[PDB]
Paper text:
Therefore, we prepared a 32 bp duplex bearing azaN adjacent to a 5′ G paired with 3-deaza dA for X-ray crystallography with ADAR2-R2D E488Q. Crystals of this complex formed readily and diffracted X-rays beyond 2.8 Å. The overall structure of the asymmetric homodimeric protein bound to RNA is very similar to the structure described above (rmsd of 0.201 Å for 698 equivalent α-carbons) with well-resolved electron density for the purine:purine pair adjacent to the azaN. The position of the substrate strand is shifted slightly from that of the structure described above such that, in this structure, the base pair hydrogen bonding involves 3-deaza dA N1 to G N7 (2.8 Å) and 3-deaza dA 6-amino to G O6 (3.0 Å). Interestingly, the shift in substrate RNA strand position observed in this Gsyn:AH+anti structure allows it to adopt a phosphodiester backbone conformation that is nearly identical to that seen in complexes with RNA bearing ADARs’ preferred 5′ nearest neighbor (5′ U paired with A). The standard conformation of this phosphate in the G:3-deaza dA pair might contribute to the observed higher deamination rate relative to the G:G pair.
ADARs (adenosine deaminases that act on RNA) catalyze adenosine deamination within duplex RNA yielding inosine. ADARs are multidomain proteins with N-terminal double stranded RNA binding domains (dsRBDs) and C-terminal deaminase domains. Since the substrate for ADARs is an RNA duplex, the enzymes access the reactive adenosine using a base flipping mechanism. For instance, the nearest neighbor nucleotide preferences for ADARs show a strong bias against reaction at adenosines with a guanosine 5′ to the target adenosine (5′-GA sites).
Numbering used by the authors:
A (entry chain B): 235 to 463, 476 to 700
B (entry chain A): 316 to 699
Write the structure that this text describes.
RNA sequence: GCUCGCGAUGCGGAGGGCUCUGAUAGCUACG
RNA sequence: CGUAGCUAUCAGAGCCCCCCGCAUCGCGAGC
């Protein structure tokens, strides 16, 4: 018992409360300890849990790691063990994302800070870990409704936190390309190099890490957290409520007029989309025409971390993937929990999704049910807006520099199809899933990406 | 040693309370502390002397959503009357093993071979459910207080509210109607904070008044069993209880053979019980005839205080069922539907029970009372 | 007879904080 | 042999705080 051992180890220790926050089950107190001259702390929804984790941090830093809680143990990246000890990275990136969220909501006071799932992307450039940078912050645990889907690329289909965070990572990527391409002076400050095999690659040792307040829905979350001692089915988000249900191994594929007479919109679960990302990259098809594949190095969970189930959800379940195009791969990033994981607040989901990318001055708020911002407009994150960025980047890069031949681009879907190797990796991923007994990916009716900018 | 409805009601209440006392060291144990007491009493004839207490339980809480077990090791619902049914199930399994041991032991079993296939109760074996208060939901919600000759009947029998399916909600108070087009529960949704929903006891007892008290699995061995009486020790309201237990689903149709809409005797007792003072215990006790001692389960976790599975949990019941299954000759099964050994699938092998359950769900829907709210399917996807 | 909105008085499982009592456990102090 | 105290847990009676459909009455409107 942590404080008991800490006060039978250096028995004169006095604990300092700093700042209480929240209401009902969403409340947290911060507790601190001074022992052997080092300022420690933990977090917890009641005092005697925050103090317990503060004591655990003290004894970890001085003496030793406590109960080698066995599913609480982190897989490690195949390549890039560069940002030092996995727990120290995990705790750093969760703290960074929580701090940026605080800044973005009047120090957790704005009405938009009441959220169920927080998420974020954090960038490192160095083996040194003190030089991180929060790239994007998002919330949301909800999805557009059948009657609200856009044919003009003007509505966010998925507003779950992880997903919104990735779209903000795409906004950051377009900004970085435009930065490299606006001045020979600014090329030194872009995250991108000219690449030897063509187009752009990331400057060496630039890596991105993904934080989610909880485990992604679907497969990484199908376990009992109080008995950790197994069939990675593709699952789809149920419209209406939070949570997912497994893909039906035989049922008809969606079409645009069918989501308005008999059925709702079937969106893939966040586990599946992250697994997807671990093969095709986090940059999607359109960016791939300009840059070499980008993969996350870390998936840090602020709760419901379980090493086996997350391993399965994120890469192991599709180990059977074959013949990936060049530079694609089965990314096996670092997976970790955090120390003072947050608590389960049993309540109804918020209805808004918050997003912010580094560069912007303020968060943007989206009704996840209509995929529009709460006075009825298109998000900076939506299909149409990203495509607008992409068109502006295409206009500045010579026809030689492209990673794919695409000339005179008009329609979204066709510009996506121009990304031949990425579509190849997409097909390989789909087949891996089918052949593993895990169901077939549900794709949207291709009419909703059938739109020009005009 | 006679019959009269009020005589019977008082007799079963005395027996359950007395047996509870015997089990709790004359109510001096820390575990005697209870808000709600429930039990099952078995009769075999007209002599009140012949009544036998089968199970006793307490509890007023249900499992915390974070503690759901995907291996069937946790009790989901510790309201006393639900626990009392599960304890009776243990008894039913024991009685089948008694029948199967040998021809001499067979005489003592409450089961006999059935002419329709499988087994059925011997003539005049009856079970009676006792609850120290009105079951939550439809029977309880519109008057959660003791009745007085002065207060009228329900001044509003025709409100939409009357008869609706309702759920307990985790961290919520009261029970709630199912919403118009209420969306299905998911394992990952509950884990992330969607509040776990459980059907109210009023709704569960009505279900048992259609599909029987034995559950699906036992129905693979035995014909449907019904309560002959429901005895409340306090907060009796005749019109609400009668509506809740059956009258609300008098529109049910097309039940499979041997199923019926059972309308048991409903009664209060002559000397109504009192409110018990005290913060309500977070634990639940259970006992079945033949057990040496009570079992104490933390209702919020669904396991005992050392984290062990209850003798009443799904996994334990699946084990009892599997042992009997290996002993019953195929020609004696009531169903010959082969299904893979996963709790969910074995239940599906009880085809007629599933049909009766379907008629029940439909009765509620067509009556305007809402749709039954089931657990995430992942709950039952485990094997021994 | 209901249904909906607003108001009013009440009724019926969570989280958190401050006290009072009992039990265990570990560590001090003093005679 | 004691008393005193300090933490860590449990167990139990209090005081707040804060959440999360139903009853009774009134007003408006509708079926
Ligand atoms: O961030 P998400 O909400 O998960 O969006 C993705 C993304 O679409 P956009 O970038 O156009 O929004 C995928 O696009 P690419 O990765 O190919 O660039 C697209 O897949 P396809 O365009 O390859 O079909 C997929 O749609 P889906 O998998 O249903 O076809 C869609 O996810 P949602 O449709 O669920 O928003
Ligand atoms: O009396 P309870 O403790 O509430 O248990 C019942 C029982 O399940 P178990 O016997 O496995 O504990 C029902 O099973 P049947 O005997 O009726 O077949 C099951 O209904 P299903 O038939 O769908 O399994 C129902 O679960 P659900 O509420 O999802 O219908 C579940 O109730 P709880 O989940 O409330 O314990
Ligand atoms: Zn999700
Ligand atoms: Zn109940």
């Amino acid at each position: 018992n942590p404080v008991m051992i800490l006060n039978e180890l250096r028995p004169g220790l006095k604990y300092d409360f700093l700042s209480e926050s929240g209401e009902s089950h969403a409340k947290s107190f911060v507790m601190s300890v001074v022992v052997d001259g080092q300022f420690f702390e933990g977090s917890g929804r009641n005092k005697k849990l925050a103090k317990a984790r503060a004591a655990q941090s003290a004894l970890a830093a001085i003496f030793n790691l406590h109960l080698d809680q066995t599913p609480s143990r982190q897989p490690i990246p195949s390549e890039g063990l560069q940002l030092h000890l996995p727990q120290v990275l995990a705790d750093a990136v969760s703290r960074l994302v929580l701090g940026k969220f605080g800044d973005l909501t009047d120090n957790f006071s704005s009405p938009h800070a009441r959220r169920k799932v927080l998420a974020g992307v954090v960038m490192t450039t160095g083996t040194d870990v003190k030089d991180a940078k929060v790239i994007s912050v998002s919330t949301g645990t909800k999805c557009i409704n059948g009657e609200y889907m856009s044919d003009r690329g003007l509505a966010l289909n998925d507003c779950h936190a992880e997903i919104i965070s990735r779209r903000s990572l795409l906004r950051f990527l377009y900004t970085q390309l435009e930065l490299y391409l606006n001045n020979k002076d600014d090329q030194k400050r872009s995250i991108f190099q000219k690449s030897e095999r063509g187009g752009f690659r990331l400057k060496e040792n630039v890596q991105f890490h993904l934080y989610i307040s909880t485990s992604p829905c679907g497969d990484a979350r199908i376990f009992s957290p109080h008995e950790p001692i197994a069939r990675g089915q593709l699952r789809t988000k149920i419209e209406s409520g939070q949570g997912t249900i497994p893909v039906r191994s035989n049922a008809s594929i969606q079409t645009w007029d069918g989501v308005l007479q008999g059925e709702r919109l079937l969106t893939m679960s966040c586990s599946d989309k992250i697994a997807r990302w671990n093969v095709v990259g986090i940059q999607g098809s359109l960016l791939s025409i300009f840059v070499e594949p980008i993969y996350f190095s870390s998936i840090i969970l602020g709760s419901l971390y379980h090493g086996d189930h997350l391993s399965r959800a994120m890469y192991q379940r599709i180990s059977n993937i074959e013949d990936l195009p060049p530079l694609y791969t089965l990314n096996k990033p670092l997976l970790s929990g955090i120390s003072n994981a947050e608590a389960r607040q049993p309540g109804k989901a918020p209805n808004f999704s918050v997003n912010w990318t580094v560069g912007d001055s303020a968060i943007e708020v989206i009704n996840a049910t209509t995929g529009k911002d709460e006075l009825g407009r298109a998000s900076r994150l939506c299909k149409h807006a990203l495509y607008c960025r992409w068109m502006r980047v295409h206009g500045k890069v010579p026809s030689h520099l492209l990673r794919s031949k695409i000339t005179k681009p008009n329609v979204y879907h066709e510009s996506k199809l121009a990304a031949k190797e990425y579509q190849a990796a997409k097909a390989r991923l789909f087949t891996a899933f089918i052949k593993a007994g895990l169901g077939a990916w549900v794709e949207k009716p291709t009419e909703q990406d059938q739109f020009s900018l005009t």
